Design a protein around this ligand. Structure first.
Ligand SMILES: [Zn+2]
Ligand SMILES: [Zn+2]
Ligand SMILES: [Zn+2]
Ligand SMILES: [Zn+2]
Lengths: 286, 283
């Protein structure tokens, strides 16, 4: 319901539950979804930008978010830069929050905004450091997650949930802590849900599997196991995902073993392997 | 006002036969229009292609057809459909020991016609342009399945991942020309039934594995960002089947081993070996 009703801006709450002068919103823009922090304006409109950003980073880390992706989201940048790889403010595919304190992470984040102008990228970080920005956590499409980050009341890490992205996020943090044997649920709670899924083409899948000849196209190795019908098991992967508006065509699909298909989603060196395949496989067109 | 979807008849393995046809409507009659075995070996394997058609028609419930001559000479010189009908009786029935012997009956009737009209002595061609009509049926997708076999049904796109797998599995057997596909696929909001899952259970299981799988020995395929070893937790008795979300019903596996327990037929035996090796598990 984003039509006929002028959406009002949400404001980030401090640790005492009190509203900050720091406009924000939760939404999707140009294929990417997350928290859109509004810019520090002329005449001190969003005076608490920096301190509000400190709290967001703080709360993401305590909720188990290790890595994020921050995009430049002022109206000019989105016009003059059409790709997602270029609108991102930081080098590498994922900005990590693990290393340092929330202020240090923020200073750096605010710093990388200065390397942008309205035409494009600058030689030096001379620009403004308090622009409109979009913070993406990969895998997370939940409005309630971002709502809690703005609100300041977070869920406990042990909290059960139906969201599998939210589960993984919490586990990734729980692995670092010493866990005693948890009791669990002998009768787990089922829940009806809606999910968005794309209609896929069996011919594009089937064509890509035949051409592979049952060998993974990233690593050189052959398929791990065989199906009941006798065929080898690989998994077809869209190099430009369908969530990010990619095509369902043979010229951006690739057959991989389960392990490599996982590598390309989550690995620390995932940017190397995705470019590597655009050289090797000549049908793959970016 | 005639419409046509042009095709070649396919065999059971998806190979394009030398037997061009169409799903068309001509003079009110809608059906499969199989082109002639030509003057210079045009449509070489007409008779082969017609056997598949007769086989598929019988497989899909059709026992009766009407066959008209549809050559442009006959069209001109024979002025009613009733005289263009090759067989006596309202229908030609698809019954016999073989589709081939049925085809010989059907083509036997064709010999009783010249290019200009009906022939007193059957001394004519047995391999002519004909329209195979099934009155009552007006589906292109029905005739597409008669023309292309099971390959036309299996090629249909879907959101259902289980059905997408059944179809893909069967399409790997067939020979396939290049698909093209869609450059802007449609997203569907569909209903789903998921379970509320405990992250203490999952995180405990991943800790006690120490980065190695519980059916193959190997380490994690890659180290996840922030240095974690990448494995996947899987419920040995599914939550669908009344499985508990407990440490005694979970195992850590690499993606290869995870898919192996799901999609193999030999998975039902792999499960048994987890109860032997991993003595934590209860059932
Ligand atoms: Zn994929
Ligand atoms: Zn591989
Ligand atoms: Zn599983
Ligand atoms: Zn394994």
């Amino acid at each position: 319901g984003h039509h006929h009703h002028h959406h009002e801006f949400m404001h980030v709450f401090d640790n005492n539950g009190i509203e900050l002068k720091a406009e924000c919103s939760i939404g999707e823009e140009d294929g990417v979804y997350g928290l859109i922090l509004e810019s520090w304006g002329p005449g001190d409109r969003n005076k608490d930008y920096n301190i509000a950003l400190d709290y967001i980073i703080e709360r993401l880390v305590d909720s188990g978010v290790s890595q994020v992706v921050v995009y430049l989201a002022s109206s000019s940048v989105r016009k003059h830069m059409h790709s997602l790889d270029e609108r991102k403010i930081h080098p590498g595919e994922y900005f990590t929050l693990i290393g340092n304190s929330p202020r240090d992470i923020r200073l750096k984040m605010c710093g990388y905004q200065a390397y942008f102008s309205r035409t494009g990228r600058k030689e030096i970080p001379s620009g403004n450091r308090t622009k409109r920005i979009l913070i993406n956590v990969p895998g997370i499409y939940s409005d309630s997650f971002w709502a809690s980050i703005i609100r300041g009341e977070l869920s406990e890490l042990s909290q059960p949930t139906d969201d599998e992205s939210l589960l993984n996020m919490r586990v990734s943090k729980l692995i670092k802590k010493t866990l005693s044997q948890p009791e669990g649920s002998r009768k787990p709670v089922e829940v009806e849900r809606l999910q968005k899924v794309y209609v896929r083409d069996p011919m594009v899948e089937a064509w890509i599997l035949q051409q592979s000849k049952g060998i993974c196209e990233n690593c050189g190795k052959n398929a791990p196991f065989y199906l009941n019908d006798g065929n080898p098991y690989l998994e077809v992967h869209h190099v430009i995902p369908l969530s990010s508006g990619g095509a369902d065509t043979t010229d951006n699909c690739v057959a991989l073993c389960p392990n490599c298909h996982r590598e390309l989603h989550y690995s620390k060196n995932a940017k190397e392997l995705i470019e590597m395949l655009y050289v090797n496989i000549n049908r793959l067109q970016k």
